[PDB]
């Protein structure tokens, strides 16, 4: 009951999903061979949310792996925890998109998506009571950015009342790996804002900064970044998979976080995070957890909260702790930073308490924040987009596969409208 299915596309999405499944399997006590060997009853209490039970008593994740290139597919098959996935759920093309949004959304995506939509329909009709969808992808890569958003459109068309989650890694200016990146970033955003119920943004530069300063690691890697993202992702459904004093689900989060229909772009963060040297010098308390939570350096995004005002924020607490302490800390921080909080909604912080902390920690915190400072990323992306589009550079690849400049103009106009309407409420006063 109220289970969710997982679908991942693109190389970055596949890596994120693989590490997320590793983390979830470790937390639920499922071995890589799919056999249950947990130590507590609460481990198996609500296993139906993410897994399916087959004959013989083994568990398989309800994950659907999509791509146009078989390289990363074979890599994740041969990697660790690659035996959990059902071999049928692997669907892939044979050509690839070549970082081209047009190629991934009109030429090969349209002909390939029939089978993956069939398997998605199979899983959705097989599950008892669907709660929602969650999707991991990136907005820089062509195949992910195109096929994922087309599949979001189709899934929203076919299942209107369910929830859709997307954990998307948006482009960063300082850490760039693609030259046509702003184009398909804007094209993805235009389609995503229309259909996606929630959107969560991650930055590679933000992850690098976090791991270098807070964690003080000399040689970070994609494994570490994926581990951070996976922990932050599992923090959301912790309260759905475990009991607590104030339980809260995805619909609760959506209602309490989204004031207006198109203002649904959030930034996340995880706490506590300490280096190995300072591991024993810290004391785990609600005040210090909230301090690290509201620290701007802990955000998974390059956007600075001091450049905007918070609309709403949420804090999911894991572990055994008193409710009065959490409530008093929330009120104290909201009163102390009143200038940084929007004033026409009182008590714009939601707190949830769960009684099961992550394995190895007595306490932990997940933060989801909707603040006006997120417009900066769209501003930079649109600046790059218009700078390249004024010269029509690299445009023949997109124009030679069915599209024309009017679609680009419409996408730019929609992004600008989103930025303007999102900035309006920052200076709107009561």
């Amino acid at each position: 009951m109220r289970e969710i299915v997982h679908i991942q596309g693109g190389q970055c999405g596949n890596q994120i999903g693989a590490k997320f499944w590793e983390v979830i399997s470790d937390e639920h006590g499922i071995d890589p061979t799919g056999t249950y060997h947990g130590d507590s009853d609460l481990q198996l209490e609500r296993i139906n949310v993410y897994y399916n039970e087959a004959t013989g008593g083994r568990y398989v994740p309800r994950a659907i792996l999509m791509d146009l290139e078989p390289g990363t597919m074979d890599s994740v098959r041969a990697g660790p925890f690659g035996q959990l996935f059902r071999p049928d759920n692997f669907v892939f093309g044979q050509t690839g998109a070549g970082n081209n949004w047009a190629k991934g959304h009109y030429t090969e995506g349209a002909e390939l998506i029939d089978s993956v939509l069939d398997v998605v329909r199979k899983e959705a009709e097989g599950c008892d009571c669907l709660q929602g969808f969650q999707i991991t992808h990136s907005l820089g890569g062509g195949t992910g950015s195109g096929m994922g958003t087309l599949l979001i459109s189709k899934v929203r068309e076919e299942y209107p009342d369910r929830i859709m989650e997307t954990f998307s890694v948006v482009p960063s200016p300082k850490v760039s790996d693609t030259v046509v990146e702003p184009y398909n970033a804007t094209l993805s955003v235009h389609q995503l804002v229309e259909n996606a119920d929630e959107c969560m943004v991650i930055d590679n530069e933000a992850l690098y900064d976090i791991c270098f300063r807070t964690l003080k690691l000399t040689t970070p890697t994609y494994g570490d970044l994926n581990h951070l993202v996976s922990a932050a992702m599992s923090g959301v459904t912790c309260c759905l998979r475990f009991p607590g004093q104030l339980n809260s689900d995805l619909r609760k989060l959506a209602v309490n976080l989204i004031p207006f229909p198109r203002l649904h772009f959030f930034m996340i963060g995880f706490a506590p995070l300490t280096s190995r040297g300072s591991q024993q010098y810290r004391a785990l308390t609600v005040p210090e957890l909230t301090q690290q939570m509201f620290d701007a350096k802990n955000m998974m995004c390059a956007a600075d909260p001091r450049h905007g005002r918070y609309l709403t924020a949420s804090a999911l607490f894991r572990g055994r702790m008193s409710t009065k302490e959490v409530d008093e800390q929330m009120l104290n921080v909201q009163n102390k930073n009143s200038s940084y909080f929007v004033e026409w909604i009182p008590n714009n912080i939601k707190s949830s308490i769960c009684d099961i902390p992550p394995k190895g920690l007595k306490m932990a915190v997940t933060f989801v924040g909707n603040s006006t400072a997120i417009q900066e990323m769209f501003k930079r992306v649109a600046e790059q987009f218009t700078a390249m589009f004024r010269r029509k550079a690299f445009l023949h690849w997109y124009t030679g596969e069915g599209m024309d400049e009017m679609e680009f103009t419409e996408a730019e106009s929609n992004m600008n409208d989103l930025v303007s309407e999102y900035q309006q409420y920052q200076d709107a006063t009561a």
């Binding site: 074979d74 890599s75 041969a78 990697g79």
Partner: peptide, 27 residues
Amino acid sequence: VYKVDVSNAVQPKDYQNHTHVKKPNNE
């Protein structure tokens, strides 16, 4: 030049072992 440079540069060796990259208690 070709015979002395390319033809007889390699030997049966350098092919033998070729491997590349694969895919608390207290209380």
